[PDB]
Symmetry: C2
Subunit: 618 residues, 2 copies
Amino acid sequence: AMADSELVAQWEKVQIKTFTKWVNMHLAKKGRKINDVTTDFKNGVELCALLEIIGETTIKCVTNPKMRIQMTENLDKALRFIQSRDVKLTGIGPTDIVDGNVKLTLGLVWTLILRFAISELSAEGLSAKQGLLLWCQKKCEPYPVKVENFSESFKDGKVFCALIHRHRPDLLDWETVGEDDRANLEKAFDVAEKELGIPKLLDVDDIVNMPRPDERSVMTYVAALYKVFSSNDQVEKAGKRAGNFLDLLRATEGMVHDYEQRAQALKENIEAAINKMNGVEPSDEYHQVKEQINETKNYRKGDKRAFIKEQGDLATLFGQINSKLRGMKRPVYVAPEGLDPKSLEGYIANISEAERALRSKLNTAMRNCLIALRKAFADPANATDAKINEYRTFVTDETSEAPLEEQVATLKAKLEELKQVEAQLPPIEEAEKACGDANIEDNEYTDVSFDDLQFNYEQTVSMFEKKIVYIEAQINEASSGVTAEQMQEFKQSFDAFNGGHNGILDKLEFRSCLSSMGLIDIDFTGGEDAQYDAIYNNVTKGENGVSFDNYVQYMKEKNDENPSPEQLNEIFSTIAAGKDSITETDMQKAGMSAEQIEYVKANLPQKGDGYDYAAWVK
Amino acid sequence: AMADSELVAQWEKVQIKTFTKWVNMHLAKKGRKINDVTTDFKNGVELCALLEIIGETTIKCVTNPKMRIQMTENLDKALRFIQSRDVKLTGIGPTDIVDGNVKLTLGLVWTLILRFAISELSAEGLSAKQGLLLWCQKKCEPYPVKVENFSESFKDGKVFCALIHRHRPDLLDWETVGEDDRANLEKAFDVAEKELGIPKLLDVDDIVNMPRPDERSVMTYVAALYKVFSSNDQVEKAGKRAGNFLDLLRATEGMVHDYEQRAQALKENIEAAINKMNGVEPSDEYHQVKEQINETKNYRKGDKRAFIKEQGDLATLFGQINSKLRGMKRPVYVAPEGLDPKSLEGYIANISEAERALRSKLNTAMRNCLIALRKAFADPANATDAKINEYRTFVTDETSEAPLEEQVATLKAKLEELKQVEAQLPPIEEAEKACGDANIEDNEYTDVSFDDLQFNYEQTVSMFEKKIVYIEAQINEASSGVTAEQMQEFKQSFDAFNGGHNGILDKLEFRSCLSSMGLIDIDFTGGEDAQYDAIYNNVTKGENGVSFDNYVQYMKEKNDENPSPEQLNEIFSTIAAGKDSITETDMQKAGMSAEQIEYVKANLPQKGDGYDYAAWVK
């Protein structure tokens, strides 16, 4: 019977803890927390922040008021906001909150619970407390619970469970509740804490011990029932975070499209290039293989660069996107068969093999091409040097005992044959020149030169021609008055003066010849010599040019001008008047230029009084 | 006794022939000849030419006078010249010569013989005939001859011989004359004819037959005695011809000096060149052998040309001078030993051999030089490719069963060793480049390239580094919250973004990295991003750069932003208010962008009314 009064005190102790737990449930949204409503509101600051959250209005209370006037001034403005909303003002002034009056402060925390948690639940004749009760009565209708108030009804804790299942059957089982006061209460409070976001405003020990739980406290835990809604409606903002999370996944999905676009391009472009290398056939021509070698240099400078680089970059892309997935705890991306990075690396290894196989083909094409070019020249140059030298040996061979007229037949034979090789020379000149265009600079094949060929040819032909004329001259020594060794001299000069093998001496050629022989003082280049013009007319019968026959006729006439050995004897005799030794004196009387005389003196032997010419008969 | 009168007639016959023979002896100097003095003077022309030779004066008689007046006019002027010189005029008029009077004409031919042959031989009381007789008497003093007149004295012919011997003992022997009238006479007349130039004015038959030879005739043959002098004094002009002959020989002698000067120069210049070729030592350097090869090209273009040409020209000079000698019937010129044309030809053959021996040495220098250059590159390239590939094989070999912490020790071992080969690469690059400067274009020695070396190196080192980090990551998976496959992704991106091996991410490098990951919209090149600047400050503690440790710390914080699999479950539950299948409707009420919704619809499986997320718990 005594129970009544005793009960009220312990209720106050419970009501102070639960009212505290209700304030910092809203304050925690702003990082703020309080220990005790009866002491932490004395400065007015913590009330303004609580009013600002539940009120959606900016109050500017003085952040740490030290003197009583700022605290009281604080509560005039902060309280005036409270009073603006139809909360029951009743007794309270600002000083009542500064001075820390328990029962009035609890009454003030009570009014803003009705105003800000359950106000709208007024319903055409229903207070905040009543409508909330009817709300509770509705929600547990399927359940074997008896709900009369906010004390006795809640004590079993069977009604706490019935509210959560009705809204969320997912997280709390019903076929569970029995004689475990502690279990069902803890069951509810932890469920509210972990998935509903409601703090355990109520202590599990403090309810099982008491005859009745405090109405206001349990009424307050009713604000906690809605504060679970309140939190979730703010966790719909937390649910909008998953929109950013959705964005990230959708972006990550996109970059795999960029990978696959690029990976396919690389596979395409590679297979293509391999084919171009595999498609080219190595040349035979040097300049062609040179260009073919140059085209592989063009690849390695440009596309090869690009093919290795993109492969790496795509290995990086792949790893970067899977970095994202792994970190967002979604399953890893695997690429479509043969387009994963390691298969991409393999195509690189495939083209790195195609080029090496083609450069190998092309190296060897160059070697073979180059040996060809050297053999092009060496093999015929060797064969041709051999021929021109066999003929050389032959005209050099002094010894033949056969008749002289037989010698020239045989000689003229061999020359005709050797003259035939002349033809095969200019192909050899080509092949040497072709080696110079191919910048070849050694030839293991031949030590011969084309110039050596031409010189050996031209030399050996002259040796043939020179022997055949000379043996011709020895046949005709008989019939005509010209020693074979004299004909040689004539032919030697004539041929030396006739520039081509046009078989005649020009007007101009003849002059150069005679000026050499000193038959006219060398006036050959410039002037129009009346003397020469007369000599040339004479010599060239109608050949417009000096036939060799006409040349020899001229020379014979020049020779015929000269005196005989014995005719020259008589010439001297006449000077000396028959003396064998010729004195300077009688000779002088003959009147020769001193030059003439000194020449005699220096030439022929002195024999006493004069000089002998019996030596000159020899 | 009767003899007297008979004798006079035959004398006239003899006197006409000898007077004729005397006229044409002088006329022959002008190509003119007459048959008969008694008939050939009737036109006056032949007398004028005879007077012009013996008189040294130009008469202009009418060249062929047809009418008697020109002939007579002719003889007035021509006779007047005769009369000018103190010849005895006596009876003769011009008509006497036209009419062809024998005795007067003979008398006229007689006077000009005295005037023009023996005049000056008048001597302080002596006629022309007498002084000539005393002249004869003097000259035969040593001889057993008796000289009284110009008839009987000369008949034996012993006096004719005595005159010639006295002047010229050379050509007619004295110990000879006997009873041969015919011999001594013929002996004299032929001697006078061949060497004295006097025609046989006297007939050998006509003297032996007669009692006396005609005085005037034999007197005339006395003019022939002097006409032999007269001829020789004109053959002193013929002796001046030998001055021209002397000139020719002296010129021919000169040209042998020009030959010897030139032949010596050629011998000198050749021996010298041979020595320069024999003196050069073939190079080892390519560019050097190239230049050495080029110097032989310079010879063949220039000096070789000149050396062959001068040799020929001097063969021509030699033959030309001996042409002159041979034609002037002097003995041939022989050249001083080793400077004759055929020895000159031999020195040509000697230098034609020195060049061929040197080009052979130089060909081979090139070949050996070039093989060196290829082996320079091929041998180390082959050895080095082998090493980098043995290490490649090793990191490729998947299989080792030994502890993971042992694997990384062993791995880091091999990498350190392989890293050592890095050094030997740039010498190989040189040797390849050196082959390009030596324009080598094939290499039988190696199919390797330097680029292949560098790529195989750089690739294989990355493969080592990538395995060692990954096995490092597997050791530290335990202690720190990062899967080894996640570390790989981090390291792969980081290394990909750090340009050098400076072990940090730049301000600039970090941006490029994050813009890639899309952690800020790609504003990386241009602008000064307040956001990024704030992020960079945060991340780089004081490294002025992003340490990898700092990079991983950043990435871990980005990962920590993401929700749990089961945390994400609760996020969905809250949207559906505890429904397992999520309807478009309640979700829509949550207010996601339609893009978000369509993404869900397209991603997760439809399970009745809504879409399942039990799949996403996996």
